[PDB]
């Protein structure tokens, strides 16, 4: 049942790799739904982690201004230093100076509590629309700001199954990528 799920494709020869197959032959359909959801979600953070690393290895901090002296991708220095935390004194310019792995250690503890709360709200909507409302699409969390999912409808169309397979795969690229990009931050292992 695992070898006729969605995420298999040509790049392993249209069959899932056998060690990853070995954990889910004799398992429930809720088990393949759980691992599909945890694969997409791990791909979802890892895709954001690349651009969060690309603006951290560069100096594309706030404020964003594509002209010169505007802290854009071309000239990454600023003149305004928009003050991420006023009671701390830290600006966005201070974050882009140190390092990729030093960046999260300048963010205050109340700054992560704003992030982890609305992420805590979002993972509650994600659990409700996927598991309680038992949606047949893995990773379908009801979030579609532009209405891509109103296409034909519905999910049994070529444009969404192509988009579903492109999402898992671009999350599959970014999962090893952030693991390899944070590897060079940890250890020289760029083999």
């Amino acid at each position: 049942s695992i070898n006729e799920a969605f995420g298999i494709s040509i790049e392993t020869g249209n069959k899932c790799p056998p060690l990853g197959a070995r954990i889910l032959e004799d398992a429930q359909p809720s088990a393949i739904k759980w691992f599909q959801n945890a694969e997409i979600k791990h791909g979802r953070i890892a895709m954001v982690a690349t651009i969060g690393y690309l603006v951290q290895k560069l100096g594309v901090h706030f404020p964003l201004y594509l002209g010169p002296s505007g802290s854009n991708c071309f000239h990454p220095e600023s003149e305004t230093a928009w003050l991420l935390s006023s009671s701390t004194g830290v600006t966005f310019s201070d974050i882009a100076k140190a390092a990729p792995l030093d960046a999260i250690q300048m963010v205050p503890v109340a700054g992560w509590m704003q992030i982890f709360f609305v992420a805590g709200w979002f993972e509650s909507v994600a659990y409700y629309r996927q598991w309680v409302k038992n949606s047949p699409i893995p990773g379908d969390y009801g979030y579609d700001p532009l209405g891509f999912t109103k296409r034909e409808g519905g999910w049994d169309s070529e444009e969404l199954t192509s988009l579903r397979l492109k999402e898992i795969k671009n999350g599959r690229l970014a999962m090893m990528t952030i693991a390899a990009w944070v590897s060079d931050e940890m250890i020289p292992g760029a083999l």
């Binding site: 004799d26 398992a27 429930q28 359909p29 809720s30 088990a31 739904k33 759980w34």
Partner: protein, 169 residues
């Protein structure tokens, strides 16, 4: 019912096999205590399995608090007596979890159809659907759980006699 197979010979007793291993004979002396015994074996088994991982993992990595460090407590064997405010919060929330099982312990016989040790806890869905390897999945929990019951006595006294790291000396 599910734990009585083998071949698994008993060490320091080369004739006895573990198939229907019951030399005192609790199954024939008091058969009505047998669902209480399976619930007690699995609870002894599941607590000893986390005790084995919990005895060797704080040897290498510690939680980032600075009262749990290696400079604060180098040995794992005195962490129970060195962090008392950490133990009441483990004891307090287990006490809540154990109190919600008293109406399940009060109906362990033929009251309602809950199998002993079954807490309906399978969020990752790893219980197989076909029944003939559900029993070996139950047997794997019992054999790994019985082994960790033996091992945590060897891990603790292996560290109480010889203060050392993981394997032992």
């Amino acid at each position: 019912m599910v734990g009585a197979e083998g071949p698994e010979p008993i060490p320091f007793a080369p004739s006895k096999t573990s198939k229907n291993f019951d030399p005192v004979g609790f199954a024939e002396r008091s058969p009505e205590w047998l669902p209480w015994y399976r619930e007690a074996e699995l609870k002894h088994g599941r607590a000893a399995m986390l005790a084995t991982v919990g005895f060797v993992v704080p040897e290498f990595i510690r939680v980032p608090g600075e009262q749990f460090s290696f400079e604060a407590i180098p040995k794992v064997i005195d962490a129970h007596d060195a962090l008392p405010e950490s133990m009441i919060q483990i004891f307090g929330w287990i006490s809540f979890l154990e109190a919600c099982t008293f109406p399940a312990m009060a109906g362990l016989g033929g009251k309602y159809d809950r199998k002993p040790g079954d807490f309906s806890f399978d969020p990752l869905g790893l219980y197989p659907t076909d029944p003939e390897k559900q029993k070996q999945m139950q047997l794997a929990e019992l054999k790994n759980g019985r082994l960790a019951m033996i091992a945590i006595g060897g891990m603790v006294t292996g560290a109480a006699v010889t203060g050392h790291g993981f394997p032992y000396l």
